[PDB]
Amino acid sequence: SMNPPPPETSNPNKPKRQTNQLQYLLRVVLKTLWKHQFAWPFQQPVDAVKLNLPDYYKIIKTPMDMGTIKKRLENNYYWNAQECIQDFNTMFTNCYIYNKPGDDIVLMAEALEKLFLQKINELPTEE
Ligand X SMILES: Cc1nnc2n1-c1ccccc1C(c1ccccc1)=N[C@H]2NC(=O)OCc1ccccc1
Number of residues that bind ligand X (CB under 6 A): 11
The vertex-32 CA angle with 27 and 29, nearest 5°, equals 50
- Contacts of residue 77, defined as CB under 8 A and 6 or more positions apart, other chains included, come to 9, 10, 11, 14, 16, 71
Q: Which is nearer to ligand X, 21 or 63 (CB)?
A: 63
Q: Residue 89 is which amino acid? A: N
Q: Which of 53, 85, 111, 115 binds ligand X (CB under 6 A)?
A: 53
Q: Which is nearer to ligand X, 46 or 84 (CB)?
A: 46
| 45 in contact with ligand X (CB under 6 A) | no
Q: List alpha helices for 1-103, DSSP H.
A: 20-24, 31-34, 56-59, 66-74, 81-98
Residues within window 85-124 making contact with ligand X, judged by CB under 6 A: 95, 98-99, 104-105
Judged by the rule CB under 6 A, the positions of this chain that interact with ligand X are 41-42, 46, 51-53, 95, 98-99, 104-105
